[PDB]
Design a protein around this ligand. Sequence first.
Ligand SMILES: O=c1[nH]cnc2c1sc1c(Cl)ccc(Cl)c12
Length: 274
Amino acid sequence: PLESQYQVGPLLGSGGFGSVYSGIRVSDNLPVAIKHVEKDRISDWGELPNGTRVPMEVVLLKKVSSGFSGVIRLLDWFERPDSFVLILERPEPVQDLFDFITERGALQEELARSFFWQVLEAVRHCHNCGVLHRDIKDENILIDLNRGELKLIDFGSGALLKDTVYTDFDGTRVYSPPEWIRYHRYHGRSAAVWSLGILLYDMVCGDIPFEHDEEIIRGQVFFRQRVSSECQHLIRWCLALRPSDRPTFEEIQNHPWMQDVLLPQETAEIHLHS
Ligand SMILES: O=c1[nH]cnc2c1sc1c(Cl)ccc(Cl)c12
């Protein structure tokens, strides 16, 4: 044990999630990301199937790590006196969706469809595993640029999925539903669907629809870019003011805008230029 196991490269990012470095597993030259989180910046703690005091983020990542490639998988973790260190898979080359949208602007609908579909599969996988992400947004999605595959990251604001009301939240406010803003109360699935509507709008328009609380509460969607009526309808459906008026995951994936999605590799070859 100990970081004789890993060679450390450049800082890849830092923010609310901690600090993430590029890394190489010395053992087999596996590319990895190395994420440092300060103990004092951790509020939510859980314990393992084993039963040790770990950050909730480790509990959640363990529950979603395995066969599916929709989430960036936890390979290992270490405790330090003042911090935890997490070793995560690193696709190469990779770009986060926020940066991809910054570089390219509003996405063509065919591309947004494939991207949005993969996000839905990823979020469904988390929920099936009993994990609520609570911070779905472009900054928390990585693109494996050669494979055309999207991967969910930073579960540091998430929770165990439950069927009762959540009264806490520490994700991104501008992706948070009106019921959180007004009442400080939400249910996990319908909150997630709201965040998915914001993300979808973000993809086809090149920015998020709401910046202020009053915009969120009003729920009035203005399309700033040319977007098909089918896409507008799905977006408007996801952004329903009443949580029960929002579509289920099945209803989203069965929507006419979602039909005939590109395969990931088709997506990379057409849009990411493989
Ligand atoms: O978990 C993460 N949080 C924040 N950033 C990242 C991760 S993984 C990862 C990988 Cl693999 C490549 C590049 C970045 Cl910036 C991140």
